[PDB]
Each structure stands twice: as structure tokens, then as C-alpha cells.
Amino acid sequence: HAYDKLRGLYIPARFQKSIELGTLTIRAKPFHDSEELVPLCYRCSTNNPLLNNLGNVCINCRQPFIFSASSYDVLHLVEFYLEEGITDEEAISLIPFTAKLSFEQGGSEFVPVVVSRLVLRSMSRRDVLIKRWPPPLRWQYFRSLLPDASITMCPSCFQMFHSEDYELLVLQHGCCPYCRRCKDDPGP
Amino acid sequence: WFYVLGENAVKKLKDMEYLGTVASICLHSDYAAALFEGKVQLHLIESEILDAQEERETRLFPAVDDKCRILCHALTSDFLIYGTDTGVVQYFYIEDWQFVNDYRHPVSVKKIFPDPNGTRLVFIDEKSDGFVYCPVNDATYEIPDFSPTIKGVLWENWPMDKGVFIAYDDDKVYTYVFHKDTIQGAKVILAGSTKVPFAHKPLLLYNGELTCQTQSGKVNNIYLSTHGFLSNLKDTGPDELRPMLAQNLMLKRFSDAWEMCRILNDEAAWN
Amino acid sequence: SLVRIHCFQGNVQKAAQIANETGNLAASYHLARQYESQEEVGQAVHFYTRAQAFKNAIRLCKENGLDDQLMNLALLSSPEDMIEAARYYEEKGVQMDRAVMLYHKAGHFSKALELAFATQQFV
Question: Considering only CB atoms, which chain B residues are within 8 Å of A24?
């Protein structure tokens, strides 16, 4: 499918030579894709086709995918929204969720996950990531659905990573690979 | 009878007997393809008995035992290719041991000639009409002015000229260019003709130099008339260089065409 | 990249010498992961500590029951991580001396007193 899409574009000569051999050598191979590559939606447990017309959203629940800024794997995170009349400071002071994610499946459009004081009290601070944007932006809240697979987030740019990748990238670069904040730099 | 082309010596491997008179045979990779009773046998040239599946040592085509007879075949780095009396052209991929393309022509396919990879084919039909077939988009392009006297076809092995091929008979070679990528869409064009000395048989085309076998057993090289510009331009100035320029423009070799226009120093040649 | 290629060639000792002599954090981290894969827990924790990657060393200690090396990691870390380590010992009930010592070293007298009451640690 990618070699047929390339034939709709103005290919340069270096890539053209490799694409002629590449087109034969793929058309030769089997007519299926490896199941281990197919991305899972963690909200609805649906396997998503490797390219789709809707883009970086689940084909079933239309949940936006959240990606590791090291590797672009989908991150076992679901974004959620506070119920009306809860402040960001109250939400942190408070910090059932899976039982919302099982109920909302099969709709025609994206529905945001809305979270009450009772559900916030049932969370743990180890599982929750919070993007503390400067004003005028509101803070964004995310729940990890696999606590045993650790996620780290940059305090400057709020990009998300597997923790092992983030520590290795910060050791390689001496700083966050996306926004160049050093590990020793006190935040704003 | 099969032989290994080692660096220090040539060794006879084996002799093999087929079910009828062999019309033709082709070799590539570890494999040979032989045509006899209107059926093709594909087989290994070398067999090691341990750790291989028996169905990969040899296979017979057409493998479903259809009523169609194979009239011609070819073998590349990746593909067995063949043409039938029912006008079918089929590609079989050797590494995963499976069919991968099928085309039907309105009449039988009499001969076939792939490029060095297999991505273009020339085929000759029952009316002796020549066609370029592109399995990669399943399209066919009729070869213009194709003589019914044509005995065979050779593709150019030079990197700038991948779309160039030649068709030949006992007296002449015809030079053809398949233009794949152009704003008008893909087409075959006759670039010219070269007279061949009596009973010379073409074997290899490289950079417009055609190597032929003679009746004496020796080889001889013929530069194509479509390639006369490859001679040393500076001593005739514009006269060999103007046909070089035209051909280098058409082959997209614009770094060569620049040095040619630098020699001419004409505002028209730059335009 | 030197430690990576020496580790790939199977020369782990020369890699360790380079990591020890240079003090490079990324090299010490990579070497620690190789030792982790080889199940050499003590050398792995040492090079994770040399890499300042305290969380991997803490996890590897908790999985292997290295409560002694977890105490060294706690005493090198902040008072909050001393308290989290005290709590891990308090949850086992086996190392209540290290738990009360870490609450007292962290300056948290109310919980040091509540836990020294609960463990009857008169000293």
C-alpha cells in the first residue's frame, strides 16, 4: 500500500531505484500484516488498522491516541475531564473509572471521559499525569491503565515518554530531547 | 548437464533427464527452469539432502494441471515467468514459492524477455506483435513498428538507461525506450535501428555496446547507431555532441548535458 | 558507545573499567542493564547508583529483597523517599529499627513516636 502510494508522488532518482526493487520484492511476499504491530486502543480494547481515514484516533471509540515522544508507541493513557464545579487544586487534593470506559463504547462521535469527586478519590497519584499549562490554558488530566509500565512526563513541555526511554534520552542529551531543559534546572 | 563456475576450476555437477525434448532452459539464483512437453520444470541446480522441504527441490508448471500449454518462460533473481497458448502470462515468486501476478492477452504468448530484476517484461504474441508488460501496475504497452521477423529481445544493463531495450532479427537491431514517468503517461518509443553483420547473434547490451556471437565461435562488439555520440566529442566539436545532448536530455543525465552546453556557448542550446 | 561495543563483544570487564574510570552516567546505566540481564544484582545496583538512577536500583532491590541496599538508597535520597522506604520496612514488619531510624533521620517525630510506640522501641 505504501509502494502504491509512492507511485502517486514525484519520486527523486535515488528513491526511484530502491522503489522499483522494493515494489517487486514486496509483491512477492505474503498478503497480510503481523498482528504484533497492530495498535490497541486502551479505552475500548480494540485492535486498530495500521493506517485509517480518521487519523490518530481509535476507529471504534474515536479516542485520540497519546504517543511516546521517544518511539511513537501508543502509551496506555486515557485523557479525562473534571466534572463542573471542581477546581484544579481541589482535583489534586482529591487525587469506578474503568466502569465508565466499558460503558461508553460503540458511539458515532468522540465522547470525553468526565470524572466526579468520588472517582477522583478512587484514583492514586502514581497512576495520574497532570499537564500544568500556564494561563490562559486549563490543566489536562490523564489516567494510566497499566501502572506496572511506568510513564514519565517533562515538567517544561509536557511531552510523555516511557520512563526508561526518558532517563536514557536525558542521559544521552543532558536535557529533555524535545524542549532542551537540563535535569538540574529548577522549573519556572 | 550442469557445471559450477568456480574461480580456480569448472566442475560438472550432474546430468538430468526430462519427460520430453527440451525447447529451452534458463538459470538464475540456485535454480534452473526447463521447458519441454508444453510444461515447465523449475528445480535446484545443487541439492543438499538435509534440512529442505521436498516440494522446493522441484516443481512442475502449470501446477493445477490446467489444459493450457506453456510456450515460453524466463528466470530472474526472484521470479519464474511464463507465457501460454491461452495468452496467459504468469509470475511465480521463488523465495515464498507462490504465484503473484496473472495477465491474459487476447491471443497466445509466443516469447517473453524480462528486465534484469523482472519489473518490466517484453512479450511477443501469436500475431508476432511486441508488448511491454509491467506486472507492478498490471499494464501493457504496444511496441511501435515491431517487425514480425524479430527473434529476440535484450534489456540495457547500464544504470542511466533502465527503460532501454533492443529487439533483433538476422539483419537488424531496433532500439526501444520505455518512458515510464512523463506528463503524457507511460509509453514505448522507437529510438532507431542498427544493421547487424551476417549471422551475428546478440548476447549482452551494455551502455549502447552490443556483444554478439559470430559463426566462428568468437564474440564481437557493435556500438548501436543510437549511441554514436559516445565517441570523443571534442575532435568533431558540435557534430557528435548535439546528438549526445539530445540523448542525455532524454535520459535525464543533465550533469553531462551541462558540460556539452558549456562547449557550445549558444543562448539557444541553454534555452 | 565504547561500553556498548565492549558489552556487545562480551568484554564486560573492560567496559566496567571504562565506566569506573570515566564516571559517565549513561555508560554506567547501560552496564547496569547488562548486569541486570545477567542476574548479577549487586553489580547492577552499584552501577545504577553510580548512574544516579535511584528508581531502577530501588525497584531491583524491592524485587530481590535487598533491604540493606534499599537503606543505602534511602539514606542517599530525600527525606520523603526515606519515609517511603521506612513505610516499605514498616509494611514488612521485619526491619522496624530501619523504619524508625529513617522517620527520626527525616525529622518526622510524630510518626517516629507513633511507630516507636507500636514497635515498643524504648531506645
Answer: 78-79, 117-119, 136
What's the grid cell of residue C33? 542493564
Structural determination approach: cryo-EM
CA distances in angstroms from A82 to A116, A140, B110, listed in the order given: 7, 9, 75
End-to-end CA distance of chain B: 59
Q: Does the beta carbon of B137 lie under 8 angstroms from any beta carbon of chain A?
A: yes
Residue C21 grid cell: 574510570
- The owner of cell 509470475 is B91
Q: Which residues of A touch C (CB under 8 A)?
A: 163, 167-168, 171-172
Can you tell me the distance from the alpha carbon of A121 to that of A117, in angstroms, rounded to the nearest whole number? 6
Which residues, in sequence order, are CB contacts of A103 under 8 Å at separation 6+? none
Q: Which residues of C touch A167 (CB under 8 A)?
A: 29, 53, 56
CA distance A129 to B158: 59
Picking from B133, B154, B31, B119, the residue whose alpha carbon sits closest to that of residue B83 is: B133
Question: What is the Cα–Cα distance from A91 to A119, expressed in whole angstroms?
Answer: 10
For B206, the 3-state DSSP assignment is strand
Q: Residues B134-170, buried b or exposed e (16+ Cβ, 10 A)?
A: bbbeeeebebeebeeebeebbbbeeeebbbbbbbbee
Instruction: With CB atoms and an 8 Å threshold, state whether A24 touches B137.
Output: no
Q: How close C94 comes to chain A (CA, Å)? A: 26
Residues of chain A found within 8 Å of residue C59, distances taken between Cβ atoms: none
Torsion of CA A155, A156, A160, A161, to 10 degrees: -80
- Take residue B87 and report the three cell numbers written for it: 495468452
Contacts of A31 (CB under 8 A, 6+ apart): none
Cα first-last separation, chain C = 52
What resolution (Å)? 3.5
From the list A11, A20, A28, the residue facing B78 with the nearest CB is A28
Residue of A nearest to B119 (CA): A24
